[PDB]
């Protein structure tokens, strides 16, 4: 299957298939930005947190230009356009305005800034927030599949067969474990760090085939269209990070975590009403949350330990008089299977749960060779020329301009 | 590589792809039926209008029943549903109401009656008009492709490879001839009599590459959807054949040929206003026919020769003072390249032309081998009770009860 293709790879072998070969959350955010913040500028920057061991030494610069440049030639196909307008997404129709789809029909990834620096690549995307946000996933994809490709370059047909066979076996074992929890609800979130498109596709097919109803879909829009699965995702920290950087006063900065919910609710409802509160600390978030936040459908404890984070949300729901059995907790992050089973077994019957399976699903070839990790990202660095920042539930793991981080930390505070 | 496919083809190898692997006009008609004649019953009968050549000796009955059975297993796919709702057809958006599509989303082919006799197969589909109409095409494609597989079951890799190779060269040489008339407009219309699904797909691709802009589309909606081509088609004889057999008053009958136009024009308009006169003889149709028939976009002479039938309909507009240069004639009655070329040069610049290329396009292997084609149909037999009849524009090729055939003949008359 896939082991045969790698070997068979003459022309360019494009990593990014189409403009919708990205995560669903990116499309919902894009429409919100297009509608409510079309004048805002936002820079996105690629960052290799694993300074150890270069990257400009594993990926030919020109191969990089080739893939990135190809991605810039992509356009919404006729069928993709029709599918976005007529398909049902979170049980709702027309979440995508015809006007917005029209704008998207002519959109194309914009210019980028690339340069080598200490065996590392500096990749930045400048311009209107609505023109740069879609660059994030594609860029990480191109880099990831290029590292994997380049690695397996030497490998011979036979070696590849053993490599992929052992990875399928490693993947399927995890399925047999999850298969033991029928009430489990899990979806795919591995586009961003996939070992490659084809492999992600195989993984997604193995999930639906192996746990049936327990598998609620994939966040990869192209794959959801191609195999008739539900597209999954709501929003990311990008939202709060930017609206917070747009704030000029204390009143505005304090309001920004809640202002994003208002903007989000102007376009979406129902099951899309999921709160992501850890950007500037969940404790600070819940303590200053307007009561109406308690009526949203669920929460996403993203940066804290699953159990501790979940219980914090539940305690708040009790405080507000809401029944947590009616609410949902969406765990995503990089949880491995053990985290998923222990988390599930712990909260079962007390609240609704949903799990996101990312890196650990779409990129676990660890001992499958007869190979490196790489903590790579492409977050928002600034908005309208001011530093975008993220002080998660673990302040020490903050993101962005150190001085700004300090300002936010001092402003929002941090749990003991 | 249709050859490699044939030899390498254990379980059932289904011929009918999906519910939309049919002619577009069938879906337009079906809707009209679903909205104007939902209670009327109509039977369809497969008839091999060829004494010589016994299909029972070529096609295995059990195989046939398998193909037929699998077909009624098919349902609209999630994507076909969305595509039919959001794609733009003859210039209009959502030509298919949500009500109708919700119905078709549940539809499945009814039961059939297969009887063996005198070396031939008898196939009848009973039920409501709207429940049998879709059997026509699928049935024809099943028999015809079974004929082909049956005739190639004893070939063998190389023998098959030469056969197709020469079939392709044959096709392409025809393409070469047609690209000489950059002004011709030709569309694919060979679904019911295609040598096979893959072959048709190849012929449409070659036609698209060869004459470029001269190629206007395909009547096969599945192909239209897969290749982003325009779906082509209007209405067929089964409309006036049923509104006739349903008539009772000697007056009601004489108003049958025009009642259909009144109905069709109530759901459709624009370029879909193509008159299909030969039903009970063009001349008769024209002698009467309300003034407004002359406001339609064009005619489709189906039973008379191209030139003869064309002038006949043009000399009508003339007297009706309507300018023929703004109208259209559509010649889709199984013509060959010469017929297309000869007919084109004859009417050039005098009127708008459109050619429907069927059998000769998708089933021409004449001398490509390193079985003899037959004339089979599956028209309307009866409606609610009364027998259905087709007094075409050539009494020697009528259809239905020979008795009722003479009544209609006597009621409408005859030209030559």
UniProtKB/Swiss-Prot annotation, chains A, B:
<protein>
    <recommendedName>
        <fullName>Nicotinate phosphoribosyltransferase</fullName>
        <ecNumber>6.3.4.21</ecNumber>
    </recommendedName>
</protein>
<dbReference type="Pfam" id="PF04095">
    <property type="entry name" value="NAPRTase"/>
</dbReference>
<dbReference type="InterPro" id="IPR007229">
    <property type="entry name" value="Nic_PRibTrfase-Fam"/>
</dbReference>
<comment type="pathway">
    <text>Cofactor biosynthesis; NAD(+) biosynthesis; nicotinate D-ribonucleotide from nicotinate: step 1/1.</text>
</comment>
<dbReference type="InterPro" id="IPR040727">
    <property type="entry name" value="NAPRTase_N"/>
</dbReference>
<keyword id="KW-0597">Phosphoprotein</keyword>
<feature type="modified residue" description="Phosphohistidine; by autocatalysis">
    <location>
        <position position="237"/>
    </location>
</feature>
<dbReference type="InterPro" id="IPR036068">
    <property type="entry name" value="Nicotinate_pribotase-like_C"/>
</dbReference>
<dbReference type="GO" id="GO:0034355">
    <property type="term" value="P:NAD biosynthetic process via the salvage pathway"/>
</dbReference>
<dbReference type="GO" id="GO:0004516">
    <property type="term" value="F:nicotinate phosphoribosyltransferase activity"/>
</dbReference>
<keyword id="KW-0662">Pyridine nucleotide biosynthesis</keyword>
<dbReference type="Pfam" id="PF17767">
    <property type="entry name" value="NAPRTase_N"/>
</dbReference>
<comment type="similarity">
    <text>Belongs to the NAPRTase family.</text>
</comment>
<keyword id="KW-0436">Ligase</keyword>
<dbReference type="GO" id="GO:0005829">
    <property type="term" value="C:cytosol"/>
</dbReference>
<dbReference type="InterPro" id="IPR006406">
    <property type="entry name" value="Nic_PRibTrfase"/>
</dbReference>
<dbReference type="InterPro" id="IPR041525">
    <property type="entry name" value="N/Namide_PRibTrfase"/>
</dbReference>
<comment type="function">
    <text>Catalyzes the synthesis of beta-nicotinate D-ribonucleotide from nicotinate and 5-phospho-D-ribose 1-phosphate at the expense of ATP.</text>
</comment>
């Amino acid at each position: 299957m896939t082991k045969t293709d790698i070997a068979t790879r003459w022309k360019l072998d494009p990593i990014v298939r189409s403009l919708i070969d990205t995560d669903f959350y990116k499309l919902l955010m894009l429409q919100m930005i297009w509608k409510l913040y079309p004048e805002v500028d936002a820079t996105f920057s690629l960052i290799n947190r694993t300074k150890t061991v270069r990257l400009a030494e594993e990926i030919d610069e020109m191969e990089l230009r080739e893939q990135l440049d190809h991605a810039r030639t992509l356009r919404l196909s006729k069928k993709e356009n029709i599918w976005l307008a007529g398909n049902t997404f979170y049980g709702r129709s027309q979440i995508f305005e015809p006007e917005f789809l029209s704008w998207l029909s002519s959109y194309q990834l914009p210019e980028y800034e690339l340069f080598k620096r200490d065996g590392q690549y500096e990749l930045n995307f400048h311009g209107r927030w609505m023109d740069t946000t879609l660059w994030e996933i594609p860029a990480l994809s191109i880099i990831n599949e290029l590292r994997s490709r380049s690695a397996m370059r030497s490998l011979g047909y036979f070696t590849l067969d053993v490599l992929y066979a052992r990875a399928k076996a490693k993947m399927w074992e995890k399925v047999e474990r999850l298969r033991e929890l029928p009430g489990l609800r899990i979806s795919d979130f591995g586009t961003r760090r996939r070992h490659s498109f084809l492999w992600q596709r195989w993984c997604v097919e193995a999930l639906k085939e192996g746990i049936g109803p327990a598998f609620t879909g994939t966040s990869n829009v192209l794959l959801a269209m191609d195999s008739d699965l539900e597209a999954v995702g709501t929003n990311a920290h990008e939202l709060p990070m930017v609206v917070a950087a747009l704030a000029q006063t204390n009143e505005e900065l304090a309001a920004a975590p809640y202002q994003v919910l208002k903007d989000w609710n102007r376009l979406y409802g129902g099951n899309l009403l999921i709160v992501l509160p850890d950007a500037f600390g969940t404790a600070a978030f819940l303590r200053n949350a307007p009561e109406w936040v308690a009526d949203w459908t669920g929460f996403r404890p993203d940066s804290a330990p699953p159990i501790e984070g979940g219980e914090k949300i539940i305690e708040w729901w009790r405080k507000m008089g809401r029944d947590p059995r009616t609410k949902m907790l969406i765990f995503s992050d990089g949880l491995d299977v053990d985290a998923i089973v222990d988390t599930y077994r712990h909260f079962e019957g007390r609240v609704r749960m949903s799990f996101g399976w990312g890196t650990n699903l779409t990129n676990d070839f660890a001992g499958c060779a007869p190979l490196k990790p790489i903590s790579i990202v492409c977050k928002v660095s600034d908005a309208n020329g001011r530093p975008a920042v993220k002080l998660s539930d673990n302040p020490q793991k903050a993101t962005g301009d150190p001085a700004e981080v300090e300002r936010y930390l001092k402003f929002f505070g941090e749990e003991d």
